[PDB]
PDB file of C-alpha atoms and ligand atoms in Angstrom:
ATOM      1  CA  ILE W   1      37.460 258.799 -26.515  1.00  0.00           C
ATOM      2  CA  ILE W   2      38.639 259.836 -22.974  1.00  0.00           C
ATOM      3  CA  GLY W   3      37.984 263.330 -21.700  1.00  0.00           C
ATOM      4  CA  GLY W   4      35.838 264.391 -24.673  1.00  0.00           C
ATOM      5  CA  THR W   5      32.351 265.738 -25.330  1.00  0.00           C
ATOM      6  CA  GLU W   6      29.292 264.312 -27.009  1.00  0.00           C
ATOM      7  CA  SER W   7      29.406 265.240 -30.657  1.00  0.00           C
ATOM      8  CA  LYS W   8      26.576 267.222 -32.139  1.00  0.00           C
ATOM      9  CA  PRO W   9      24.432 264.412 -33.709  1.00  0.00           C
ATOM     10  CA  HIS W  10      25.377 263.722 -37.327  1.00  0.00           C
ATOM     11  CA  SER W  11      27.847 266.637 -37.401  1.00  0.00           C
ATOM     12  CA  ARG W  12      30.563 264.256 -38.671  1.00  0.00           C
ATOM     13  CA  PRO W  13      28.733 262.488 -41.422  1.00  0.00           C
ATOM     14  CA  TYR W  14      31.827 260.603 -42.731  1.00  0.00           C
ATOM     15  CA  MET W  15      32.163 258.617 -39.430  1.00  0.00           C
ATOM     16  CA  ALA W  16      31.955 254.857 -39.658  1.00  0.00           C
ATOM     17  CA  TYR W  17      31.248 252.465 -36.855  1.00  0.00           C
ATOM     18  CA  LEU W  18      32.791 249.105 -37.524  1.00  0.00           C
ATOM     19  CA  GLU W  19      32.008 245.674 -36.042  1.00  0.00           C
ATOM     20  CA  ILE W  20      35.038 243.349 -36.548  1.00  0.00           C
ATOM     21  CA  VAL W  21      34.018 239.747 -36.698  1.00  0.00           C
ATOM     22  CA  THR W  22      36.413 236.826 -36.194  1.00  0.00           C
ATOM     23  CA  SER W  23      35.696 233.052 -36.041  1.00  0.00           C
ATOM     24  CA  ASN W  24      36.947 232.297 -32.505  1.00  0.00           C
ATOM     25  CA  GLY W  25      35.901 235.264 -30.339  1.00  0.00           C
ATOM     26  CA  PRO W  26      33.165 237.854 -29.955  1.00  0.00           C
ATOM     27  CA  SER W  27      32.819 241.073 -31.966  1.00  0.00           C
ATOM     28  CA  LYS W  28      35.317 243.888 -31.506  1.00  0.00           C
ATOM     29  CA  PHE W  29      34.906 247.433 -32.653  1.00  0.00           C
ATOM     30  CA  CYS W  30      36.685 250.193 -34.509  1.00  0.00           C
ATOM     31  CA  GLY W  31      36.041 253.461 -36.214  1.00  0.00           C
ATOM     32  CA  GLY W  32      36.817 254.551 -39.746  1.00  0.00           C
ATOM     33  CA  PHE W  33      35.719 257.203 -42.256  1.00  0.00           C
ATOM     34  CA  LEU W  34      34.033 257.242 -45.529  1.00  0.00           C
ATOM     35  CA  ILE W  35      36.404 258.583 -48.253  1.00  0.00           C
ATOM     36  CA  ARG W  36      34.432 257.565 -51.401  1.00  0.00           C
ATOM     37  CA  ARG W  37      30.795 256.433 -51.441  1.00  0.00           C
ATOM     38  CA  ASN W  38      32.037 252.803 -51.601  1.00  0.00           C
ATOM     39  CA  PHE W  39      35.290 252.998 -49.555  1.00  0.00           C
ATOM     40  CA  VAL W  40      35.974 253.367 -45.829  1.00  0.00           C
ATOM     41  CA  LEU W  41      39.516 254.076 -44.468  1.00  0.00           C
ATOM     42  CA  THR W  42      40.509 252.544 -41.181  1.00  0.00           C
ATOM     43  CA  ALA W  43      43.380 250.821 -39.315  1.00  0.00           C
ATOM     44  CA  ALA W  44      44.850 247.406 -40.584  1.00  0.00           C
ATOM     45  CA  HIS W  45      44.761 246.050 -37.170  1.00  0.00           C
ATOM     46  CA  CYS W  46      40.982 246.121 -37.429  1.00  0.00           C
ATOM     47  CA  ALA W  47      41.007 243.456 -40.171  1.00  0.00           C
ATOM     48  CA  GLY W  48      38.900 240.388 -39.528  1.00  0.00           C
ATOM     49  CA  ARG W  49      37.086 237.606 -41.085  1.00  0.00           C
ATOM     50  CA  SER W  50      34.245 239.940 -41.960  1.00  0.00           C
ATOM     51  CA  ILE W  51      33.385 243.480 -41.101  1.00  0.00           C
ATOM     52  CA  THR W  52      30.090 245.520 -40.972  1.00  0.00           C
ATOM     53  CA  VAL W  53      30.013 249.131 -41.425  1.00  0.00           C
ATOM     54  CA  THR W  54      27.263 251.451 -39.967  1.00  0.00           C
ATOM     55  CA  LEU W  55      27.130 255.041 -41.321  1.00  0.00           C
ATOM     56  CA  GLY W  56      24.849 257.799 -40.139  1.00  0.00           C
ATOM     57  CA  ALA W  57      24.967 256.846 -36.506  1.00  0.00           C
ATOM     58  CA  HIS W  58      24.997 259.008 -33.339  1.00  0.00           C
ATOM     59  CA  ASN W  59      23.677 256.796 -30.540  1.00  0.00           C
ATOM     60  CA  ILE W  60      24.826 253.439 -31.918  1.00  0.00           C
ATOM     61  CA  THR W  61      22.257 251.560 -29.575  1.00  0.00           C
ATOM     62  CA  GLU W  62      19.167 253.309 -31.142  1.00  0.00           C
ATOM     63  CA  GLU W  63      18.200 252.364 -34.635  1.00  0.00           C
ATOM     64  CA  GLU W  64      17.147 255.317 -36.791  1.00  0.00           C
ATOM     65  CA  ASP W  65      16.403 256.215 -40.407  1.00  0.00           C
ATOM     66  CA  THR W  66      19.783 257.875 -40.862  1.00  0.00           C
ATOM     67  CA  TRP W  67      21.548 254.486 -40.291  1.00  0.00           C
ATOM     68  CA  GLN W  68      23.038 252.675 -43.340  1.00  0.00           C
ATOM     69  CA  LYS W  69      24.265 249.270 -42.372  1.00  0.00           C
ATOM     70  CA  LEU W  70      26.556 248.372 -45.246  1.00  0.00           C
ATOM     71  CA  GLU W  71      28.226 245.180 -46.285  1.00  0.00           C
ATOM     72  CA  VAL W  72      32.012 245.079 -46.928  1.00  0.00           C
ATOM     73  CA  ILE W  73      32.979 243.034 -49.846  1.00  0.00           C
ATOM     74  CA  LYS W  74      36.769 243.225 -49.656  1.00  0.00           C
ATOM     75  CA  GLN W  75      39.370 244.380 -47.186  1.00  0.00           C
ATOM     76  CA  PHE W  76      42.607 245.952 -48.540  1.00  0.00           C
ATOM     77  CA  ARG W  77      45.169 245.833 -45.661  1.00  0.00           C
ATOM     78  CA  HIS W  78      48.443 247.669 -46.442  1.00  0.00           C
ATOM     79  CA  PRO W  79      50.722 245.044 -47.976  1.00  0.00           C
ATOM     80  CA  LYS W  80      53.609 246.158 -45.607  1.00  0.00           C
ATOM     81  CA  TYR W  81      51.525 246.156 -42.421  1.00  0.00           C
ATOM     82  CA  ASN W  82      53.734 244.677 -39.713  1.00  0.00           C
ATOM     83  CA  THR W  83      51.996 243.093 -36.665  1.00  0.00           C
ATOM     84  CA  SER W  84      55.118 243.491 -34.513  1.00  0.00           C
ATOM     85  CA  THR W  85      56.198 247.151 -35.231  1.00  0.00           C
ATOM     86  CA  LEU W  86      52.682 248.290 -36.148  1.00  0.00           C
ATOM     87  CA  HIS W  87      54.085 250.219 -39.182  1.00  0.00           C
ATOM     88  CA  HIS W  88      51.730 250.824 -42.029  1.00  0.00           C
ATOM     89  CA  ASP W  89      48.541 250.353 -39.926  1.00  0.00           C
ATOM     90  CA  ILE W  90      46.097 251.328 -42.582  1.00  0.00           C
ATOM     91  CA  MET W  91      43.396 249.552 -44.573  1.00  0.00           C
ATOM     92  CA  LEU W  92      40.670 250.300 -47.145  1.00  0.00           C
ATOM     93  CA  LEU W  93      37.230 248.629 -46.947  1.00  0.00           C
ATOM     94  CA  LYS W  94      35.361 248.375 -50.220  1.00  0.00           C
ATOM     95  CA  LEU W  95      31.623 248.472 -49.744  1.00  0.00           C
ATOM     96  CA  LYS W  96      29.327 246.131 -51.731  1.00  0.00           C
ATOM     97  CA  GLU W  97      27.148 249.200 -52.706  1.00  0.00           C
ATOM     98  CA  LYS W  98      27.664 252.915 -52.747  1.00  0.00           C
ATOM     99  CA  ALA W  99      26.380 254.682 -49.645  1.00  0.00           C
ATOM    100  CA  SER W 100      23.407 257.037 -50.029  1.00  0.00           C
ATOM    101  CA  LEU W 101      24.357 260.667 -49.620  1.00  0.00           C
ATOM    102  CA  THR W 102      22.076 262.274 -46.904  1.00  0.00           C
ATOM    103  CA  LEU W 103      22.537 265.073 -44.389  1.00  0.00           C
ATOM    104  CA  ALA W 104      23.827 262.399 -42.003  1.00  0.00           C
ATOM    105  CA  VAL W 105      26.076 260.470 -44.395  1.00  0.00           C
ATOM    106  CA  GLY W 106      28.772 261.969 -46.729  1.00  0.00           C
ATOM    107  CA  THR W 107      32.367 261.479 -47.778  1.00  0.00           C
ATOM    108  CA  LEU W 108      35.604 263.119 -46.479  1.00  0.00           C
ATOM    109  CA  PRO W 109      38.378 262.921 -49.103  1.00  0.00           C
ATOM    110  CA  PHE W 110      41.770 264.461 -48.229  1.00  0.00           C
ATOM    111  CA  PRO W 111      44.197 266.113 -50.546  1.00  0.00           C
ATOM    112  CA  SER W 112      47.953 265.982 -51.316  1.00  0.00           C
ATOM    113  CA  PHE W 113      53.255 268.414 -42.235  1.00  0.00           C
ATOM    114  CA  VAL W 114      50.976 270.258 -39.898  1.00  0.00           C
ATOM    115  CA  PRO W 115      53.290 271.731 -37.333  1.00  0.00           C
ATOM    116  CA  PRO W 116      53.299 270.556 -33.689  1.00  0.00           C
ATOM    117  CA  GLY W 117      51.401 272.714 -31.122  1.00  0.00           C
ATOM    118  CA  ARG W 118      48.384 272.758 -33.436  1.00  0.00           C
ATOM    119  CA  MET W 119      45.077 271.537 -32.015  1.00  0.00           C
ATOM    120  CA  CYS W 120      43.227 268.774 -33.920  1.00  0.00           C
ATOM    121  CA  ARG W 121      40.029 266.823 -33.234  1.00  0.00           C
ATOM    122  CA  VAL W 122      39.278 263.124 -33.128  1.00  0.00           C
ATOM    123  CA  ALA W 123      35.938 261.321 -32.704  1.00  0.00           C
ATOM    124  CA  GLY W 124      34.805 257.791 -31.985  1.00  0.00           C
ATOM    125  CA  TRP W 125      32.572 255.537 -30.058  1.00  0.00           C
ATOM    126  CA  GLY W 126      35.515 253.918 -28.115  1.00  0.00           C
ATOM    127  CA  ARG W 127      36.090 253.436 -24.362  1.00  0.00           C
ATOM    128  CA  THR W 128      35.772 256.547 -22.235  1.00  0.00           C
ATOM    129  CA  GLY W 129      38.258 255.079 -19.622  1.00  0.00           C
ATOM    130  CA  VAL W 130      40.405 251.959 -19.014  1.00  0.00           C
ATOM    131  CA  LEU W 131      37.673 250.349 -17.047  1.00  0.00           C
ATOM    132  CA  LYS W 132      34.701 251.606 -19.083  1.00  0.00           C
ATOM    133  CA  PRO W 133      32.791 250.337 -22.125  1.00  0.00           C
ATOM    134  CA  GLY W 134      32.514 252.127 -25.423  1.00  0.00           C
ATOM    135  CA  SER W 135      30.373 255.158 -25.481  1.00  0.00           C
ATOM    136  CA  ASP W 136      26.818 254.695 -26.880  1.00  0.00           C
ATOM    137  CA  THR W 137      27.052 258.239 -28.389  1.00  0.00           C
ATOM    138  CA  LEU W 138      29.748 259.590 -30.775  1.00  0.00           C
ATOM    139  CA  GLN W 139      32.299 261.502 -28.664  1.00  0.00           C
ATOM    140  CA  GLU W 140      35.053 263.904 -29.773  1.00  0.00           C
ATOM    141  CA  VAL W 141      38.039 265.593 -28.243  1.00  0.00           C
ATOM    142  CA  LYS W 142      40.495 268.359 -29.100  1.00  0.00           C
ATOM    143  CA  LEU W 143      44.135 267.099 -28.752  1.00  0.00           C
ATOM    144  CA  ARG W 144      47.564 268.679 -29.191  1.00  0.00           C
ATOM    145  CA  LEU W 145      49.757 267.496 -32.033  1.00  0.00           C
ATOM    146  CA  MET W 146      53.062 266.797 -30.403  1.00  0.00           C
ATOM    147  CA  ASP W 147      56.714 266.871 -31.290  1.00  0.00           C
ATOM    148  CA  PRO W 148      57.775 263.322 -32.229  1.00  0.00           C
ATOM    149  CA  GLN W 149      60.006 263.048 -29.065  1.00  0.00           C
ATOM    150  CA  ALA W 150      56.805 262.951 -27.024  1.00  0.00           C
ATOM    151  CA  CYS W 151      56.278 259.516 -28.559  1.00  0.00           C
ATOM    152  CA  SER W 152      59.780 258.186 -28.237  1.00  0.00           C
ATOM    153  CA  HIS W 153      58.779 255.603 -25.566  1.00  0.00           C
ATOM    154  CA  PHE W 154      56.847 253.749 -28.345  1.00  0.00           C
ATOM    155  CA  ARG W 155      60.066 252.235 -29.564  1.00  0.00           C
ATOM    156  CA  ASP W 156      58.696 251.584 -33.046  1.00  0.00           C
ATOM    157  CA  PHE W 157      57.147 255.007 -33.486  1.00  0.00           C
ATOM    158  CA  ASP W 158      58.468 256.962 -36.527  1.00  0.00           C
ATOM    159  CA  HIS W 159      57.936 260.552 -37.188  1.00  0.00           C
ATOM    160  CA  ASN W 160      57.625 260.249 -40.890  1.00  0.00           C
ATOM    161  CA  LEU W 161      55.029 257.406 -40.687  1.00  0.00           C
ATOM    162  CA  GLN W 162      53.071 258.591 -37.691  1.00  0.00           C
ATOM    163  CA  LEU W 163      51.664 261.490 -35.705  1.00  0.00           C
ATOM    164  CA  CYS W 164      52.165 261.796 -31.995  1.00  0.00           C
ATOM    165  CA  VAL W 165      48.843 263.065 -30.559  1.00  0.00           C
ATOM    166  CA  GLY W 166      47.695 264.248 -27.120  1.00  0.00           C
ATOM    167  CA  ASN W 167      49.547 266.361 -24.436  1.00  0.00           C
ATOM    168  CA  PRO W 168      50.796 263.942 -21.709  1.00  0.00           C
ATOM    169  CA  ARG W 169      49.708 266.455 -19.082  1.00  0.00           C
ATOM    170  CA  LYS W 170      46.018 265.624 -19.760  1.00  0.00           C
ATOM    171  CA  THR W 171      43.877 262.532 -19.761  1.00  0.00           C
ATOM    172  CA  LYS W 172      42.316 263.553 -23.070  1.00  0.00           C
ATOM    173  CA  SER W 173      42.968 260.855 -25.710  1.00  0.00           C
ATOM    174  CA  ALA W 174      41.800 258.443 -28.422  1.00  0.00           C
ATOM    175  CA  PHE W 175      41.551 254.994 -26.837  1.00  0.00           C
ATOM    176  CA  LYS W 176      40.431 251.386 -27.571  1.00  0.00           C
ATOM    177  CA  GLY W 177      37.465 251.270 -29.822  1.00  0.00           C
ATOM    178  CA  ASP W 178      38.480 254.502 -31.659  1.00  0.00           C
ATOM    179  CA  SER W 179      41.099 252.828 -33.891  1.00  0.00           C
ATOM    180  CA  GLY W 180      40.746 253.890 -37.458  1.00  0.00           C
ATOM    181  CA  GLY W 181      38.969 257.158 -36.700  1.00  0.00           C
ATOM    182  CA  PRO W 182      40.149 260.321 -38.483  1.00  0.00           C
ATOM    183  CA  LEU W 183      42.162 263.112 -36.809  1.00  0.00           C
ATOM    184  CA  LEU W 184      41.063 266.413 -38.383  1.00  0.00           C
ATOM    185  CA  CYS W 185      43.180 269.546 -38.240  1.00  0.00           C
ATOM    186  CA  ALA W 186      41.270 272.659 -39.356  1.00  0.00           C
ATOM    187  CA  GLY W 187      38.765 270.337 -40.952  1.00  0.00           C
ATOM    188  CA  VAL W 188      41.183 268.282 -43.037  1.00  0.00           C
ATOM    189  CA  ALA W 189      41.912 264.647 -42.138  1.00  0.00           C
ATOM    190  CA  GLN W 190      45.632 264.209 -41.222  1.00  0.00           C
ATOM    191  CA  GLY W 191      45.770 260.962 -39.274  1.00  0.00           C
ATOM    192  CA  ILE W 192      43.873 257.872 -38.222  1.00  0.00           C
ATOM    193  CA  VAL W 193      43.935 256.416 -34.742  1.00  0.00           C
ATOM    194  CA  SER W 194      46.460 253.427 -34.475  1.00  0.00           C
ATOM    195  CA  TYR W 195      47.674 252.538 -30.956  1.00  0.00           C
ATOM    196  CA  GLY W 196      48.719 253.725 -27.489  1.00  0.00           C
ATOM    197  CA  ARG W 197      49.310 252.527 -23.989  1.00  0.00           C
ATOM    198  CA  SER W 198      46.979 249.999 -22.207  1.00  0.00           C
ATOM    199  CA  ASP W 199      46.672 252.493 -19.278  1.00  0.00           C
ATOM    200  CA  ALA W 200      45.523 255.164 -21.700  1.00  0.00           C
ATOM    201  CA  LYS W 201      48.177 257.841 -20.731  1.00  0.00           C
ATOM    202  CA  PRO W 202      48.547 260.038 -23.845  1.00  0.00           C
ATOM    203  CA  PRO W 203      50.141 260.623 -26.342  1.00  0.00           C
ATOM    204  CA  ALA W 204      48.781 258.052 -28.737  1.00  0.00           C
ATOM    205  CA  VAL W 205      50.114 257.069 -32.159  1.00  0.00           C
ATOM    206  CA  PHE W 206      48.171 257.929 -35.301  1.00  0.00           C
ATOM    207  CA  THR W 207      48.975 256.807 -38.938  1.00  0.00           C
ATOM    208  CA  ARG W 208      50.173 259.812 -40.883  1.00  0.00           C
ATOM    209  CA  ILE W 209      47.786 259.421 -43.883  1.00  0.00           C
ATOM    210  CA  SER W 210      49.777 261.775 -46.180  1.00  0.00           C
ATOM    211  CA  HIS W 211      52.540 259.189 -46.402  1.00  0.00           C
ATOM    212  CA  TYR W 212      49.833 256.645 -47.655  1.00  0.00           C
ATOM    213  CA  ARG W 213      47.908 258.782 -50.106  1.00  0.00           C
ATOM    214  CA  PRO W 214      49.670 257.352 -53.213  1.00  0.00           C
ATOM    215  CA  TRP W 215      48.850 253.760 -52.036  1.00  0.00           C
ATOM    216  CA  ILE W 216      45.261 254.779 -51.286  1.00  0.00           C
ATOM    217  CA  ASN W 217      44.909 256.177 -54.790  1.00  0.00           C
ATOM    218  CA  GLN W 218      46.382 252.998 -56.346  1.00  0.00           C
ATOM    219  CA  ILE W 219      43.745 250.862 -54.593  1.00  0.00           C
ATOM    220  CA  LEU W 220      40.906 253.267 -55.445  1.00  0.00           C
ATOM    221  CA  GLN W 221      41.889 253.263 -59.167  1.00  0.00           C
ATOM    222  CA  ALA W 222      42.269 249.383 -59.551  1.00  0.00           C
ATOM    223  CA  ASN W 223      39.009 248.644 -57.751  1.00  0.00           C
TER     224      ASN W 223
HETATM  225  C1  LIG K   1      39.938 247.415 -29.268  1.00  0.00           C
HETATM  226  C2  LIG K   1      41.177 247.004 -30.197  1.00  0.00           C
HETATM  227  C3  LIG K   1      40.838 246.140 -31.340  1.00  0.00           C
HETATM  228  C4  LIG K   1      39.613 246.279 -32.084  1.00  0.00           C
HETATM  229  C5  LIG K   1      39.373 245.523 -33.174  1.00  0.00           C
HETATM  230  C6  LIG K   1      40.294 244.559 -33.578  1.00  0.00           C
HETATM  231  C7  LIG K   1      41.502 244.367 -32.961  1.00  0.00           C
HETATM  232  C8  LIG K   1      41.764 245.223 -31.825  1.00  0.00           C
HETATM  233  C9  LIG K   1      42.106 248.087 -30.570  1.00  0.00           C
HETATM  234  O1  LIG K   1      42.065 249.047 -31.444  1.00  0.00           O
HETATM  235  C10 LIG K   1      43.142 247.680 -29.759  1.00  0.00           C
HETATM  236  C11 LIG K   1      44.587 247.960 -29.378  1.00  0.00           C
HETATM  237  C12 LIG K   1      45.489 247.587 -30.552  1.00  0.00           C
HETATM  238  C13 LIG K   1      46.156 248.506 -31.286  1.00  0.00           C
HETATM  239  C14 LIG K   1      46.983 248.083 -32.413  1.00  0.00           C
HETATM  240  C15 LIG K   1      47.175 246.736 -32.605  1.00  0.00           C
HETATM  241  C16 LIG K   1      46.463 245.807 -31.837  1.00  0.00           C
HETATM  242  C17 LIG K   1      45.688 246.180 -30.787  1.00  0.00           C
HETATM  243  C18 LIG K   1      44.758 249.317 -28.769  1.00  0.00           C
HETATM  244  C19 LIG K   1      45.526 249.508 -27.542  1.00  0.00           C
HETATM  245  C20 LIG K   1      45.669 250.676 -26.933  1.00  0.00           C
HETATM  246  C21 LIG K   1      45.199 251.877 -27.614  1.00  0.00           C
HETATM  247  C22 LIG K   1      45.441 253.210 -27.021  1.00  0.00           C
HETATM  248  C23 LIG K   1      45.075 254.376 -27.649  1.00  0.00           C
HETATM  249  C24 LIG K   1      44.326 254.216 -28.875  1.00  0.00           C
HETATM  250  C25 LIG K   1      44.108 252.955 -29.457  1.00  0.00           C
HETATM  251  C26 LIG K   1      44.604 251.781 -28.857  1.00  0.00           C
HETATM  252  C27 LIG K   1      44.286 250.616 -29.418  1.00  0.00           C
HETATM  253  C28 LIG K   1      42.313 246.629 -29.274  1.00  0.00           C
HETATM  254  O2  LIG K   1      42.446 245.601 -28.483  1.00  0.00           O
HETATM  255 ZN1  LIG K   2      19.679 260.904 -35.836  1.00  0.00          ZN
END
């Protein structure tokens, strides 16, 4: 998160910190959010050979009793996810066990467009600048939902599939390490962080989760 503030600790109890493990390089990192006690929603580009999930974190470098480090037993990457266009960048992680509900850990389901100009909030442990590591503490930022023309320069952006997020006038943005984190508008999840520019100039592109709610429900019901 660039240009944000430190979250009040444990104020976003659905937030998931993901470590993405692959066989030929070091760990990479994503966000996500708990939508059922045994399912986390995140981005498909965060898939790996294995993934761990930490719930209940604030400062991710300091172990505490609120942490729940949970095994993922299966990754459900959207079957139409396209690595070239980045369409359908959405994935469900099924947890081995159900998370414990605590003050620090709870679910955020979302129901069955929010107009541009509205302000929304996104949180994450991602990089705080192009040349900076991920934040040790959960950060959040208020961003403007944009008209889709603001994201035209992402040639594969599509208004019905994706949200365009972050006024280009500001540095405020989701960034690398924040992928998969929820965008909340008036407390309701509307998007997850997908991609943006290497140089971090907003807007960034978020998956429009409303489009995917039927698919999410079909995975949840079969598993
Ligand atoms: C850390 C990283 C990652 C983490 C775990 C596994 C793989 C990659 C991840 O996310 C990305 C890419 C990306 C996005 C989409 C597809 C590939 C790479 C990215 C670049 C610019 C952005 C700008 C604004 C916000 C998010 C951005 C995300 C990574 O590199
Ligand atoms: Zn704590």
